[PDB]
Write a protein that binds this ligand. Structure first.
Ligand SMILES: CC(C)S(=O)(=O)NC[C@@H](C)c1ccc(-n2cc(CO)c(C(F)(F)F)n2)cc1
Ligand SMILES: N[C@@H](CCC(=O)O)C(=O)O
Ligand SMILES: N[C@@H](CCC(=O)O)C(=O)O
Lengths: 263, 263
């Protein structure tokens, strides 16, 4: 039919979407800033639609409950028609690509290790061969699923430890996992996406480090309900923005230019 | 209808598709080896189709002639229905994504600089600020198009030089550009994709080097004619292979394990 204001689902995750400090003075899309706030503005311009940013109610990326088969998070908001598009650091996975459409990826990432500086760990293999330092992942996301499914020996060894560890090694939010690394005196390491890991390393108090190579190679995509009319224009817009240098400019804006830990 | 043997278009490009040395003893798909030979076998298995590898007649990736609007290369083979699928290091671009379907990317790359070891160049900026050392790209591909379209100052400066340079800085095949770097005593630098650059650096005579960071961020996709029934199963297969670790294993097989220049 006639063009309608598009409901965008997204998630509070630095530096993608962040509440402006004075947000209670502000209304609508003006409450928020970040890489995905900027990317939403670009996508909507290039597709000629009006839109409203909404933070996912349950604060989750998206996983399907094994008993109910109900999708939660941003994936769930698309699946049940509560949002028209998800513009967020939402990982392209086979289990999701089957229930939602994903654009070509707008950013690459791989799973990585965050340590408190000085922690005697340089790799996933190192983590797996010891017990002094606990380690975990975010709940309700692609990292946790990577470990759960992995048939690779070292990651399977890691998963077997993590699923049964006490107290729990899993966290609800990235901020929580970061707080735990910062406050555990080197006795907790966090497995999170390289992109997030990199942003945090350049933020005060400058007490974390990314170590080792990435565990996998993947991407974030703009997601739409399966068969949405938005899917095609959205994908073309991501490719156009890539080719125009805009994605690179936005990455520099929200990563390099936001660096607080020196050169 | 009933399932038919799929015609695969591909291109002789190391280490993706390479003639086996004894190929005149061999027939059909057995003539060829490489990353994309292996990837084709995996894709066809996961999609349950039989297939025939064919080398693109004109030896080109795909560009559209500005006067005729006729597509050449592997893109042209898809557009005119001479091939059912292209399984090759074929770059996802907006001009192509509009005439063919691309899978989610199976490998990432960026444009990069190849020099003869000892060449006093470390970046694109360095190349642009001098004239002693000539530099160019492959014809009929995404690298040449990147420079031609770029609105970025340094790349526009590079393009202005390259388009008018004499003798021509452009080459028909990657092997030709590599030969020119090797035989020009440091007076020619070649702009090519990081993936290819990396493979060549680890091959005898070990006389080239990749320098500087990548100029862009993009990917190779499996391409199909627009609206092909193969598009969906092919994409799911790429995601499944990614998640299974197969793409990483194949990268190690054809890059790291093929290294001839030491550690
Ligand atoms: C035209 C650009 C917008 S594009 O689409 O290339 N995307 C732009 C860039 C940043 C990108 C490239 C490849 C990937 N990627 C995803 C996967 C797995 O899905 C893999 C691999 F190869 F490691 F398996 N790479 C993710 C992101
Ligand atoms: N980007 C991930 C969330 C972060 C993580 O799982 O580490 C997802 O889409 O589920
Ligand atoms: N992968 C490129 C060819 C190599 C290049 O242009 O450097 C393409 O699809 O056109």
């Amino acid at each position: 039919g006639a063009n309608k204001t598009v409901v965008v689902t997204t998630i509070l995750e630095s530096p993608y979407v962040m509440m402006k400090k004075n947000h209670e003075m502000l209304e609508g899309n003006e409450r928020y800033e970040g890489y995905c706030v900027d990317l939403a503005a670009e996508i909507a311009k290039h597709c000629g639609f009006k839109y409203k940013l909404t933070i996912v109610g349950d604060g989750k990326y998206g996983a399907r409950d094994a008993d109910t088969k109900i999708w939660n998070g941003m994936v769930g908001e698309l699946v049940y028609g509560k949002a028209d598009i998800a513009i967020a650091p939402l990982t392209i996975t086979l289990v999701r690509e089957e229930v939602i459409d994903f654009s070509k990826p707008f950013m690459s990432l791989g799973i990585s290790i965050m340590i408190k500086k000085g922690t005697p760990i340089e790799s996933a293999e190192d983590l797996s061969k010891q017990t002094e330092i606990a380690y975990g992942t975010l709940d309700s996301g692609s990292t946790k699923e990577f470990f759960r499914r992995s048939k690779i020996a070292v990651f399977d060894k890691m998963w077997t430890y993590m699923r049964s560890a006490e107290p729990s090694v899993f966290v609800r939010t990235t901020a929580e996992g970061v707080a735990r690394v910062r406050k555990s005196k080197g006795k907790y390491a966090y497995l999170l996406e390289s992109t997030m890991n990199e942003y945090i390393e350049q933020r005060k108090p400058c007490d974390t480090m990314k170590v080792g190579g990435n565990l996998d190679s993947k991407g974030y995509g703009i997601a739409t309900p399966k068969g949405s009319s938005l899917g095609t224009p959205v994908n073309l817009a991501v490719l156009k923005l890539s080719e125009q240098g805009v994605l690179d400019k936005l990455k520099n804006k929200w990563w390099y230019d936001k660096g607080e830990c020196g050169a």
